[PDB]
RNA sequence: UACGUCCCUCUCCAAACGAGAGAACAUGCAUGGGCUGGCAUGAGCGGGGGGCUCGUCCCGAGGCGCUGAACCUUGAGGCCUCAUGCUCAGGGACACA
């Protein structure tokens, strides 16, 4: 119940989505928002580069007071980051899509990735002690996932 | 399509981070040598108040000699190509509906 787009044929097209994935929203945010129109291969080439460094996520919404660095100019930003914990937890997901290819009969070489949405899921409650007292929230703020990707060939 | 630009890499006249100046097989980097400076004579070995032993031989701070020795010298980043090592079709992304 959950893809807010549908793919033109699903017949070469394969799904992956995650439930609830406990990484930040506003990192996954943009992890994922970057990967939205490279081919498959070259959306898993970003993040192997993110964790060695060599290049960033782009933080476009979400950025609000982050440091700002020499690599962004690739995206014609100024400030962005490497958020290695959303990285990786899309890396599985990526690795999930192109599973759901090759059981569907696909060449997962040729697959572009149509459809990123993360948006947020239900928030998780913690507590921190302040002074004089008091007690406030702590609270986790985890998202949801969801893609296809169509093939393009030819 | 090309010229190219940017990232990663290297340098520091720049620098909170970006930006900047540069270099990109280049004495460029690494180590060594010499210079230049700093400290103040290294470990080791051998020949003095006194005091043991049976003229000799041992204990003794200090001293003297080899010894302006030894060590340190660019590194947030002194000098000299003075010698040699290391690089082996630099890699990614745009430029490009």
Same mark, same amino acid.
């Given at each position: 119940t959950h893809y807010s787009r549908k793919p033109q044929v699903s017949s070469k097209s394969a799904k992956a989505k995650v439930?609830? &994935?406990?990484?930040h929203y506003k990192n996954t945010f943009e992890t994922a928002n970057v990967? #939205?129109? +490279?081919?498959l291969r070259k959306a898993q080439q970003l993040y192997r580069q993110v964790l060695a460094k060599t290049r960033c996520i782009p933080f476009?919404?979400? #950025?609000?007071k982050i440091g700002r660095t020499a690599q962004a100019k690739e995206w014609g930003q100024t400030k962005g980051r490497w958020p290695r914990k959303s990285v990786v937890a899309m890396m599985s997901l990526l690795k999930n899509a192109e599973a759901n290819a090759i059981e569907k009969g &696909?060449?997962? #070489?040729? +697959?572009v990735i149509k459809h990123v949405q993360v948006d947020q899921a239900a928030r998780m409650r913690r507590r921190t002690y302040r002074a004089h007292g008091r007690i406030t929230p702590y609270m986790c703020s985890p998202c949801h996932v969801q893609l296809f990707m169509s093939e393009k060939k030819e």
């Open positions: 439930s609830d &994935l406990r990484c990967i #939205n129109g +490279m081919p476009k919404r979400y #950025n609000g &696909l060449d997962p #070489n040729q +697959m």
